[PDB]
Amino acid sequence: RECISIHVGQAGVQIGNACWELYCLEHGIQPDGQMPSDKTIGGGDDSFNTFFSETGAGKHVPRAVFVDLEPTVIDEVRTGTYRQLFHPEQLITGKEDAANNYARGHYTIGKEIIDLVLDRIRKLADQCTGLQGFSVFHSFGGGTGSGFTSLLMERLSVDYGKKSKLEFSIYPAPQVSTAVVEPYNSILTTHTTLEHSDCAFMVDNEAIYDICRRNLDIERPTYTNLNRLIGQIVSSITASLRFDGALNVDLTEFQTNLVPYPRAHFPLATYAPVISAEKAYHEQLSVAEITNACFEPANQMVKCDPRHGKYMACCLLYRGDVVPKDVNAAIATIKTKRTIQFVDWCPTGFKVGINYEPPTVVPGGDLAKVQRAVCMLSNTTAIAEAWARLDHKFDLMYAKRAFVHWYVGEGMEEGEFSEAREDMAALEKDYEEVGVDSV
Amino acid sequence: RECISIHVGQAGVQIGNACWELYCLEHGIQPDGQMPSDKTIGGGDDSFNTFFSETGAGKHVPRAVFVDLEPTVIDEVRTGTYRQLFHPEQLITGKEDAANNYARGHYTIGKEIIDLVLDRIRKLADQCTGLQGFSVFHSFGGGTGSGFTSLLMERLSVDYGKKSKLEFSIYPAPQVSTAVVEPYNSILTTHTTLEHSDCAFMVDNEAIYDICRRNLDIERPTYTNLNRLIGQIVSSITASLRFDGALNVDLTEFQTNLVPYPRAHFPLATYAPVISAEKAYHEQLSVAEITNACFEPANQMVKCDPRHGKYMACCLLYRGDVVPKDVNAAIATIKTKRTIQFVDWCPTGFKVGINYEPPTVVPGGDLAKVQRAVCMLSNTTAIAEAWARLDHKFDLMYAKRAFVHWYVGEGMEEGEFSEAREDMAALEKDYEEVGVDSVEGEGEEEGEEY
Amino acid sequence: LKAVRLIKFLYQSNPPPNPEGTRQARRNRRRRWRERQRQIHSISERILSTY
Amino acid sequence: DLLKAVRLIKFLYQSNPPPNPEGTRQARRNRRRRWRERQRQIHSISERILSTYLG
Amino acid sequence: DLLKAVRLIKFLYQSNPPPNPEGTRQARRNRRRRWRERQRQIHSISERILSTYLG
Amino acid sequence: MREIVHIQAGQCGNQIGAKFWEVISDEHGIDPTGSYHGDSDLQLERINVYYNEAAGNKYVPRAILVDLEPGTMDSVRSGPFGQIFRPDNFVFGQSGAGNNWAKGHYTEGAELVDSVLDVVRKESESCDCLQGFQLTHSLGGGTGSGMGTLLISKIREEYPDRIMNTFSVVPSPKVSDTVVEPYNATLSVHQLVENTDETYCIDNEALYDICFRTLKLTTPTYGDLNHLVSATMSGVTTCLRFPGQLNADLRKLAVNMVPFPRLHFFMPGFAPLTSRGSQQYRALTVPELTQQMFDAKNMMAACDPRHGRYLTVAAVFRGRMSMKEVDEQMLNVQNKNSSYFVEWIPNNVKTAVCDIPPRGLKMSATFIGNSTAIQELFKRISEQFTAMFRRKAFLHWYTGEGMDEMEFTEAESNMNDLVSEYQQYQDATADEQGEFEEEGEEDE
Amino acid sequence: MREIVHIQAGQCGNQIGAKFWEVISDEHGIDPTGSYHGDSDLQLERINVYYNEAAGNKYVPRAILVDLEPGTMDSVRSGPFGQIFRPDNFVFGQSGAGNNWAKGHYTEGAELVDSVLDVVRKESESCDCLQGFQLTHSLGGGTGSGMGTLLISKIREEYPDRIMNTFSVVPSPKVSDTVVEPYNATLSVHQLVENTDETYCIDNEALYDICFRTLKLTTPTYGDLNHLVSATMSGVTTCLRFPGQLNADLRKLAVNMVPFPRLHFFMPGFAPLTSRGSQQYRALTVPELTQQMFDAK
């Protein structure tokens, strides 16, 4: 039940330290080092409070990797709400960053920093033998982003054998973005890091924008809100490993439950019973509306019609915390009468999973006390349009050969961009060939 | 057990007079000239009353030969705060000072008194039959430094035979000292003092500076507070031969279970359950946090990560004063979990040594009524980072060639520096490459070194 | 001599395969082209780099 | 046939100066940059002489 | 060189086709540009035979 | 227990040696009456370094002020501390000074400097413990430079294996109106490169420049400027003057300052800008004491921190304050500029603190530190030596008793071989990132 | 962490730079004395981007400026902050300008640009790291076009992996001391289109056109002209010198704005056209005062 996470990019380190602060606040891992529930300093390793290692004389540290070439991000992290108990010996950063592109950080200037973080990965890999994949935080154009990942996934799949891993791809939002060439780095990231992967799921910042401004009636699009929401969502995801309950199955069980194919690889994370100080005051929580409000279009990370969205799988995650009795009542109150449009020639068995021992809600945030979780990790074969729109914009901007000259002299060629277009066209046309329902 | 005590250099003579007057206040040697407890003149003749025996004039004087060509340190050991309690006539002054230059001592400036120190060691080596080795107070470059220790060790290995050569090789802090050339003598140390020795230790100065500026909060960042704490560590190690009783865990099995190998020659020290004079207000006497803050860098002399340094041996030592049954009571405290990364071909258990008789407390310093101690002394591969730091310093200095023409026109050689580099590399690779678990020699087909 | 004969012999040992099927193996065929041309050029530059 | 062309590319290898310990830390970065630029052009010329002569 | 100096001249003379086109922006503006890249390498080795006739 | 005694060589050297021994004796007080003046007996060996005991508890120097034109020795010697000596000294002859290097070095040997070797044989024998002797060598003319290099060449054979204190004075071509300066000075420092241990090349040129252009002094005489150089040399000599926690002998510091013993040229400064002339009485406390430590104004050379690669710096802080803030500001000055980053002997600093004040300003400091902007000084002297060498210029009386072209040719060739090696060491960054192993290992 | 140099040129570029740092120190107020007037103490990094370290919290630009007509710089050295400059900018002579493009391009400048490149080389490394070059460059004079073009060329063969910020004044038929300036333009941006990274078409007769016609200002002088252009480019580079959450970095600005890397002539306009003279003194709200954002005239 042991895993060590790496984080690259500025927004990657932001969601990383936000989620780790939420972890340390909800396990009682105080900034005093020890957890006051027992008498073990630093942390613990018993069954599920197992995000630590015996570094000192029982001293335990929240093992994670924070990497970005731009050096001030780790300084502004280290002066945050969890100040001094981050690692004083592995916070490795560069001097000058790639500054919002792909090619320079990957091929040219990162080639003398890949081996340093590789040696750090080896030194942390000489530690405790628990291994159930990885947890890689990255974006498409936030910090270095694609530049580290496009090399390190190949390096992990060649150097470290055929070991499983998992990654976090932050899907961008042009209304709050900071670049224009995001189709190019998106298509390059999608042909590179997905074919050398084992598990992934894409989170859209525009989906957060939609569920905030269009579903919660708040008026603040700042990355702190995104960091807190990602902390909540990834905490709910990891809470199966973090707390033991009735169906306390591992993340290896999840990744050997979800993925059907190397190409058919991505879920539609369905968790929008949206909450804040507004939508948590004097409401009533039930197992009907939070489960009936899943398949609708304005609840999704990636946009899809419910009838046009075909569920190859309909896996579910529950935070539980009261009983499994009402969950096994809602398996007939909601889950049994589901004749919703499905995929042909595949089993139609709905899955549920409940994990007890409540993760504590965010302190000092916006949401009030909430109980349930409807993190229904389905998948959708009609997310081919969600990248076909980017391929269409990339076609309408790529025939003009815009921004090519910044991506010529750093090693690649026009054949690489043709191969990236070929790979995304292959993925999409494979979905309308056999992914979307066929004969 | 009547080992010959040699003290050269400014640090050696300084901590020699300091620690021997700490024995004087420990064994009760009053400034009258003799103890009021036992009326035998000079010293006693017990099992622990054995450092002080009959060599001088029938008075069992404290036994330490004090030689250094720097004359001011011999003056302030002759004219300090005790004038007769040391050897009344056996301290011989030095005529011309080396003045912070090591290479003069081994070849030019210290050669006139090598015959005199040979006469002194022949005087003090034909003494009583108990001689388990040498209590060497080694220094690098302060006074003569490594010169007299080096010549004594080489002629003691080629002339006196194969006696043990227990060293206190201080690696001082460059902040408090003034020399810059010190990596040169610290890397000639491997050539001239390491191979022909048989056992060694380590004392340091960086961690005491770190705690005195930040943790212990004593406004004394000089050699005096360093002497005040190294006096405590020297009293702690000599308490094995100084406190004889039911649990006299002495030097005999200590020298066996310290060193496993030829070039695993360098142990480590982690003594710091210290309580200060500004903490001397009846505070918490702890037997739990002194167990809980062992592998934290506070007790460590050199800031190294225990997460990467594998241990082929571990020598635990908890010297208290309360109960001999508290040995068992502290065995059943924290030792049960101890999941510590080890070499796959070494034992696991921890030795225990206590001195349940309470000592006499040193006055006028930065210490409370200290009674209990923790020290996890062992040979660790985590000093590879410290020796890599020293080798980085020496590589930068050899690229800068500082004082090379100072250190070649007296008897040295550039090929001699190459052989010293190879000796330092041997001491590195017995801790860097061979010292880590070398399990990758069983067999596999991937394209490795067959 | 024998080196350039080897290099052009490996160049003609990479023929373009027939286009047939429901476009599964064609991407693997393009990958095989680009990679194998890359290491034949690597062998060429190594051989002419020793000499 | 191209055994003199590989000697020409070995002369492009022979156009490499030493990485200049007697070289300012800004300046041998420029030597490395003009190096990688010229072997970018050399790689373009190499795939030229690979693809064109095969026909 | 000094008789193989014209052998790179017959190398440029040998494998330089007319710029047969293939698509827009290609094969008459960028293959022509890689040919001028070859010519600027020729210019560089001309200023580098300027300094081998020096010796 | 330790002695370094007095001797002089230079037309502009006798005055500065007398005033320098006054200002190192101005707070100690050994009177010529014949009785002791004990006010602080913790400088017994410290005054014994320069004033040796020859009578009943009276500590006298071995000051041999030798001039071939003894009018200055006739005039300035009758001071308060200028008569408490052993009277068998000041051996003198009136054969002439003449501002000439060749006849001063060549013909005036057996006339005066043979008596000078005899008298320093006697006066270094009837004492306790010798560690060399002190001299304020001046290049103001030719005879002083010739007799100084004669003394250096004879004491490299008198006591060869001994570090002996050698100084130099860089002349002031603005003030020294001689028609030919750079012959004797350049050939003298040519000899002194391979004949000495250390050179504290204090100057009169750049100090004239800073007192006329920065200090705004309307009277730039040799008196107050000699007081300036005397305060600077007092801050230099504070290492051996005061008994600190280490009591550092200059025998150790001579080996300390050399990375390689060929090159021993660096000059001090005075960081807090003493007020001889334009006066102030303010207490120079810590932040204004250290704020002027990296300045391009006060340092007595062609100031260029940009052209600075310093090797060993040391500032004696005899102002009574702790060294924690001093070391923090030292780290700030160390890391705030990249010119100082050379990384040889990575602890190349020193902080020595005593409690004995030099003057009525109780808390103050100075600047001593390794000098690397001396390359333009060496060029500024050497190329105007070669300016008046190409046309065999000024052989009016530099056609000496023994003259060769090989001596001048080898002089300029070794001058070239020291300036070129200096500029090769100011370049070729062979420790910071200039190797081949910072960018991986394999880059063809 | 982030450092930008101060190299200027020309006889008009130097004075618009004087007005530039005057009006961008108007909201900073960094004194030349040493009393350490802190604009915002949390902005040590964002004063260090332009005003670099010389002493303890005494932050001065990388002050080096060159021209052969010393009267203008001796005039502007007696400004509000005209004396907070290092004694290293004074690298010049008295050879004269004469509106001669050849002497700045070819003959006279080739013996003086070596000192300028030497001083920027020995000043570039005296910080944490180097990030950006900048230049206020003009075409109204003769020497400035030539020596700016050759300086951009020399920084191309000497610092390729560094951005340079090249302000460029376009010729004017409305204000012109001499008229040869078509030749000063057709062989100035001949190679500037493939030598630098980003450029500016700050015009002069469209600039005088909006100063005269669409503002009705009775001041056809270089004073208010420099006031307006300094305010406009101050509002431009405020984004680069104050990175709150956005306003991407140096190559990042070149990444998202430059397709076909010759077409790097963006036109800096400004909405409210506030000017010394006729003034409008209401709080500028967003819609009806940012309505002057899209109008191309």
Short mmCIF file of C-alpha atoms in Angstrom, two decimals, chain A residues 96 99-101 104 177-180 400-403 405-406, chain G residues 130-131 161 246 248 251-252 254-261:
data_model
loop_
_atom_site.label_atom_id
_atom_site.label_comp_id
_atom_site.label_asym_id
_atom_site.label_seq_id
_atom_site.Cartn_x
_atom_site.Cartn_y
_atom_site.Cartn_z
CA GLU A 96 16.19 29.03 -16.14
CA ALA A 99 9.32 29.36 -20.50
CA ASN A 100 6.04 28.04 -21.93
CA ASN A 101 6.88 25.67 -24.81
CA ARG A 104 13.65 23.34 -25.33
CA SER A 177 -4.94 29.96 -20.58
CA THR A 178 -1.60 31.67 -21.21
CA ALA A 179 -0.54 30.30 -24.62
CA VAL A 180 -1.74 29.96 -28.21
CA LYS A 400 -0.61 27.95 -42.22
CA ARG A 401 2.53 26.37 -40.63
CA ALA A 402 2.28 28.73 -37.65
CA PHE A 403 4.83 28.52 -34.79
CA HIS A 405 10.07 27.84 -36.61
CA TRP A 406 10.25 27.57 -32.81
CA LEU G 130 21.03 36.74 -17.72
CA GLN G 131 17.55 36.87 -19.21
CA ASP G 161 20.23 32.31 -26.57
CA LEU G 246 0.02 36.06 -16.33
CA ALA G 248 4.21 35.33 -20.10
CA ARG G 251 10.67 33.58 -25.28
CA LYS G 252 7.08 32.83 -24.22
CA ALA G 254 7.96 35.22 -28.87
CA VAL G 255 6.33 31.77 -28.87
CA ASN G 256 2.67 32.81 -28.89
CA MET G 257 2.97 35.96 -31.05
CA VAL G 258 5.45 35.15 -33.84
CA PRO G 259 4.46 32.94 -36.75
CA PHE G 260 6.81 33.07 -39.77
CA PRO G 261 9.72 34.52 -37.74
#
